[PDB]
Amino acid sequence: LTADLLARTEANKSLNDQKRAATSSANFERSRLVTDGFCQFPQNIFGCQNAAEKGSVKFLSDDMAIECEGTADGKTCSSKAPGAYPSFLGL
Amino acid sequence: MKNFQIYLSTAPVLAAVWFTVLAGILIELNRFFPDALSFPL
């Protein structure tokens, strides 16, 4: 197993680096969504995480998009489950 | 209920609420009018 897993680590390394950069950028931008003007007063009435999950966010949503991009087939993605009840209060 | 409101009206809870709100307004003013060394004229 470890042989093929290392082989596809080598074959997918660039995409996972992009994934890690995107999630880190999302996590950092999560402190600047009002200063930069992404989840302002209207859009963040509910959870701005829910805004990123459902609506549109410059960085958070990006991660939401690539987080499950190009993952292993057959297995549920390491970054997110197939489904889940909504985050507690969009938190 | 009413007693809880009275409990809120206690000195510590009211101090915490009043300073929470005050810090909030001061932070918002320093966000929308940032970096104010002096009153402009």
Partner: protein, 165 residues
Amino acid sequence: RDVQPYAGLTPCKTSKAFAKREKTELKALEKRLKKYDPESAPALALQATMEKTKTRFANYGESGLLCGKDGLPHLIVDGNLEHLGEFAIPGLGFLYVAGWIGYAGRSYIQENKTASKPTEGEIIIDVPKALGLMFQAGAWPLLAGLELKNGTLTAPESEITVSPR
């Protein structure tokens, strides 16, 4: 605005050391930026910080600030008309606000002193009456002037407890 030099302090807008301060900070920001690729969120955050630094330095230039040899703005508090916004106007704002706070407090303590159990209301604040007195304390300077003129601001000497000496 263009301010005259005063107390051997040149205006910050025309000060070379002020420009050096701006330059230095902006270069530091660039250095911090260089390690981040432009697409990532720290790069945009640092660019926004650079913008903020530029507009701060610009605003300090235009606001008629006097800089020193060090290159940082210096406040003139002697009362000069050209630098009243440094101390006088914010000083007036503080004196107004602090007097409001104090007069709201004095009004509440005097009103609660008439209650059946004043000390319990001292820790459990009657919020409606409190807020009424707080908003009445908007005209603190007037009401304080009335108290001073009528002699009820200050308690007489005989009523106050003093040491036996």
